Amino acid sequence: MSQNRQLLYPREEMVSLVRSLDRPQENGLFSQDVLLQYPELAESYTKVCPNRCDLATAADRAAKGAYGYDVQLTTLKEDIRLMVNNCILFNGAEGAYADAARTFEKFAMGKIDAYISQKVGGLE
Structure with a gap:
């Protein structure tokens, strides 16, 4: 599954997730990185945690x-x-955890x- 030592170059997957989704309703922070504003x-950006949506947390990681x-x-x-933690906690499911x-x-x-x-030589 992986290698407990070093990482080849994790990122090709990150784009996959963000790619699967696409619907920036808020387009400001609720679905983007405030650090990429001005x-x-x-x-x-730190006060609001390092992304707590999905595409912002994945895109940022890479x-x-x-x-x-x-x-x-x-x-x-x-x-x-x-994210899921603050989701149902702050405001997200509160009943439909299955959604997260x-x-x-x-x-x-x-x-x-x-x-x-x-x-070949990174995770094996």
Whole structure:
């Protein structure tokens, strides 16, 4: 599934997720990265957590430059789980958690694709 040591170059999968979706209703922060607006609210971006939607958290993870180094892709796994947590908590399901589970599974699929891409010497 992966390699607990070093990461070849995780990113090809990230684009997959964001690619699957496409419907920027808010187009400002609820579905984008406020840090990509203007030099003034870059700080506030932290107060609102590093993306808590889906495409903003995935696109950012890769856009960051694929820092890599993962014992088991805990970075992406901790990001997706962090969203669902604040989702039902802050305001999202509150009764239909299954709604957040759907998007979660999709993410797992992408990871599998990349895993195969880097099997020659990166994740095996």
